[PDB]
Structure formats: C-alpha cells, structure tokens
Amino acid sequence: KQYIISEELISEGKWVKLEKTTYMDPTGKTRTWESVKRTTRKEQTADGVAVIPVLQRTLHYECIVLVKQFRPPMGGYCIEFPAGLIDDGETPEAAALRELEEETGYKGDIAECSPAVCMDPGLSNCTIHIVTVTINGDDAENARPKPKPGDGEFVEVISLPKNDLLQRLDALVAEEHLTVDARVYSYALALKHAN
Amino acid sequence: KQYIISEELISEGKWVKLEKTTYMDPTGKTRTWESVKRTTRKEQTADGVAVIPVLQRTLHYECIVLVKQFRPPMGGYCIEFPAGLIDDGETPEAAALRELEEETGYKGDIAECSPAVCMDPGLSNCTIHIVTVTINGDDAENARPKPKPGDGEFVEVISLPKNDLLQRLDALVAEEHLTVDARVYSYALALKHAN
Ligand SMILES: Cc1cccc(-c2nnc(Cn3c(N(C)C)nc4c3c(=O)n(C)c(=O)n4C)o2)c1
Ligand SMILES: Cc1cccc(-c2nnc(Cn3c(N(C)C)nc4c3c(=O)n(C)c(=O)n4C)o2)c1
C-alpha cells in the first residue's frame, strides 16, 4: 500500500552509502526518508549473518558463545553474536560457520538458519541471517579453540550460560564502554522470559 | 586499548549522518571505519527504545504486540517491536510506554528495562533501551486500544501468541512477504531455544 518512488545517492563510502528515499504513503502522498545501505551486497540473500553459537557440553549448561570487539561506530567495545558479511557466492550457513571459526576457533554444526531479518529498518536496509549453530564443546578439536591463526581483527571470546544469559550480560556491561548487541540482548530477554 | 582517534564528517542529513572513523587498534596502528550516526541524540542514555509488549489476558496465551509498517530503507514492510526516539528529558520507560500507546493504543506497565544496547554496532552508534512492558488486556483501558499515530506514520498492529511466536512470524511471512526485525526474531528464536 506504500511504495518506493525513487532512491537518490547522497554520499557513498567503501562500505556504506547514504540515500534519500522518496516513497508514497497510503494516502498517495510523497514523503522522504534518509536511508543507510551497505555497498557490499551482490547476489546474497542478506548482507551478513549473525551466529548464535550454542556451546554444548555434557558436564555443562549450554552456553552462548559471544565475542567482545572494539566497534568504531560505537567508540567502544561491544558484546555480539559472531557476525560478518556473507561473501560472494557464499551461503548464509557457510558464512556463519566460517565466521564462527574465524572469530572463536569453534567448529560448529548448522542447527538452523533464519530468513533475512533487518538490523535497523527505521534507518537501514541491512539484513542478516540469524544462523543457530551448535558447538560440541566436548569434542577434542573444540577443547581449546583458537580464532584460526591470523585474522586482522581483535576479538575476545566470551561463553555465557544460556540459562543465565541476561544477568551475565548486564553484569558484563555495567563496566563502561562495553555495550551488548541488541539482538544478543533480545535473545537473552526471551531466554529469561521463557525461563 | 582501542579508542576513537578522529571522527570525520562525510555527510550529515537531518536524522542521520555519515562519518569516517579513525581508531587505534591494539597493534598501535591507525585504521578507519565508516560509521553511521543519528543526529537526534542529545543528553540521553540511548537514542530510543524498543518495546516488547506482552499482552496478558487471563485464560489466554500471552501475546507479543508487534507493529507492521512500511520501512523506506527496506523498501518494504517490516514486523517490529514498537520503537521510537527517546524525547529530551524523557526516561526510557516513559518513552516506551508513550511509544507503545502511540503505535498500538495499549497502556502498559513496565516489566523491566535494558541498558542501552546497539542496533547495529558494526555500522552505527545507534542504541536503544529494550523495554519489556506488560499489558493487562483485561483492563478496560486496553479493551479498545486506540493508536495515536504521527502525521507520517501508518502502523498496523499484530498480536502474536508468545508461546508460538517464531511459527506465527513464519506464518505471517508465508501469507505475504515482509521482513521480520532481527531483534524480534532473536526474541522469537530464544523462546524456542529456552532450555
Ligand atoms: C533509536 C531508534 C530506534 C528505533 C526507531 C527509531 C526511529 N524510528 N523512527 C524514528 C524517527 N524518524 C521520523 N519520524 C518520527 C517522523 N522520521 C524519520 C525518522 C528517522 O529516523 N529517519 C531516519 C527518517 O529518515 N525519517 C524521515 O526513529 C529510532
Ligand atoms: C551485515 C553485517 C552484520 C553484522 C556485522 C557486519 C559486519 N561487521 N563487520 C563487517 C565488515 N567490515 C570490515 N571487515 C570485515 C574488515 N571492515 C569494515 C567493515 C564494515 O562493515 N565497515 C562498515 C567498515 O567500515 N569496515 C572498515 O561487517 C555486517
């Protein structure tokens, strides 16, 4: 009932561009929006993947494997699902598994993969697949995960119990410029509400 | 050990600006990032709020109150938690209850409120509080909720049972294409994952 009329390039970087979006509202009136888009999408179903890595161990509660990373847009460190762009010709599942191993060293198994879901629709067209990945933490390869030799990134790995995720997130994040990712927190919230 | 070095304005719009961010990695090397920022943040705890509205009625499943609206950056419709900017001097909780009532007509009670969390930390500094808000659907107030939408806003309200959220989201999307918000999906996903 609403439709895009035109989208005009305002400013383009290497990774991200800014667009003026002209669209029609249901009354037939023309309106505008400032839209942020990534420049790196080609034939992918979404810009990237977020990985929900479930560390499964027979002697432990399931943990969610999270990464702590400096994020320049945030001017501080962030606790996130392992995440990254889907490479050209790569599947969400493949990107998820690769990205998990690159960032954490864990070798996971696909559990499930979401449709493309939007990161911040009121602002950007950015989408990810949320790929749930199980990690056999008792398997010897996963005994001591190494974020797979060189990477170029500086990533601390954090494993938090699934049954206490939200509280463990709040605890971590009170100390300064360390922010929880919104999706991580949404996930944590539902774990808490569901019990 | 990592910190923002300089922030260079590339392009500033009314709602959103685009910056090239120079930061110091642990190696002592300077790197750049393209960062998106909202222009509308003031002296706030976060830019805005997302509301997780749990519609509660005796002898009924809890429902999650979601909103559907055309999102120009997505050039299509998205299913989201009610969300909007925190006004000046406003609390996250107050913004949440206000935003919930504006979009859905529901008058809710604060259940809990998150710290500021990142909408998309790899791209923007955008933060929200995720505010869980319970709605007594048996109260006369909420018998007949009336949205009070803003000039430009056209918001459809969709209430999905909490106990079957992920499926009902899928069901919605099968009926016709829309994008589910990532925070909504993360929430829905965790409801199934819980335990
Ligand atoms: C922090 C946060 C979290 C979730 C949602 C929001 C948000 N949703 N809408 C707005 C504000 N907004 C309005 N209005 C409220 C009219 N118009 C807008 C915008 C807008 O942001 N842009 C980028 C625009 O281009 N136009 C035209 O903010 C903000
Ligand atoms: C879709 C999605 C969802 C969640 C996280 C990401 C993401 N996180 N990092 C990247 C890729 N990236 C890299 N690298 C992987 C080096 N560098 C970057 C970027 C980058 O996006 N920008 C905006 C940049 O400015 N520089 C410098 O993508 C992508």
Numbering used by the authors:
A (entry chain A), B (entry chain B): 14 to 208
Quoted passage from the original study:
Two predominant substrates have been identified for NUDT5: 8-oxo-dGDP and adenosine 5′diphosphoribose (ADPR). NUDT5 (and NUDT9) catalyze the breakdown of ADPR to ribose-5-phosphate (R5P) and adenosine 5′-monophosphate (AMP), which permits recovery of NAD+ pools after DNA damage and poly(ADPR) polymerase (PARP) activation. In addition, NUDT5 was recently shown to be responsible for the production of PAR-mediated nuclear ATP and, thus, subsequent ATP-dependent chromatin remodeling and gene regulation following progestin or estrogen stimulation in breast cancer cells. Distinct from MTH1, NUDT5 had negligible activity against all tested oxidized and canonical nucleoside diphosphate and triphosphate species but catalyzed efficient turnover of ADPR.
The 8-dimethylamino variant, 2 (TH1713, MG assay IC50 = 70 nM), had more than 8-fold greater potency over TH1167. Preliminary lead compounds TH1533 and TH1713 each resulted in a 5 °C shift in melting temperature (Tm) at 20 µM compound concentrations, indicating inhibitor binding. To confirm the binding modality of the NUDT5 inhibitors and help guide further inhibitor development, NUDT5 was crystallized in complex with TH1713, and the structure was solved at 2.2 Å resolution. Pi stacking interactions between the theophylline ring and the indole rings of Trp28 (chain A) and Trp46 (chain B) further strengthen inhibitor binding. The oxadiazole group demonstrates variable water coordination and the 3-methylbenzene group extends into a hydrophobic cavity where it rotates between two alternate orientations. Overall, the orientations of TH1713 and TH5427 were very similar and the additional functionality at the tail and 8-positions did not cause drastic changes in the binding modality. Synthetic derivatives, TH1713 and TH1533, had more potent biochemical activity and could stabilize NUDT5 against thermal degradation in vitro; however, only TH1533 showed activity by CETSA in intact cells. TH1533 and TH1713 both suffered from very poor solubility, which also necessitated further medicinal chemistry efforts.
